[PDB]
Amino acid sequence: APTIIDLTCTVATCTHSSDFGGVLTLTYKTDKNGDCSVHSHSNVATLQE
Amino acid sequence: CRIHEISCGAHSTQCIPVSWRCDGENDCDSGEDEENC
Ligand SMILES: [Ca+2]
């Protein structure tokens, strides 16, 4: 499983609506390509993928 | 590379897992995975 170090989060745009009206981006440094299980730990927001 | 990894051709050192191949997306530098599928 790839390891992730020094990850930061910033939000490009957000608009609270029934649709997924908000996009965020994550920057990180890794060693090999692959896949991860991404999750949000609070119910105030719900992801899509 | 790893046993579960394949390089994007002999001319490139980038390695991607086996499930990356033929997924409908140009994962490699110039989409070598989708080539000849
Ligand atoms: Ca592919």
Determination approach: cryo-EM
Instruction: Report A:12-41 residues touching B (Cβ under 8 A).
Output: 32-35
Measured CA to CA in angstroms, residue B5 lies from A33, A42, B15 at distances of: 10, 35, 6
Nearest-angstrom CA–CA distance, B31 and A10: 29
Final resolution, Å: 3.5
Q: How many residues does chain B have?
A: 37
Which ranges constitute the DSSP H helices of A1-49?
none
Beta strand pairing status for B5-7 and B15-17?
antiparallel
Question: In chain A, which residues have their Cβ closer than 8 Å to the Cβ of B2?
Answer: 32
**In terms of CA atoms, which chain B residue is nearest residue A1?**
B17
Which residue type sits at B18? Answer: V
Compute, in angstroms, the gap from residue A13 CA to the centroid of ligand 1. 30
Which residue type sits at A32? Answer: K
Long-range CB contacts (within 8 A, 24+) of A35-42: A35/B17, A35/B19, A36/A1, A36/A2, A36/A4
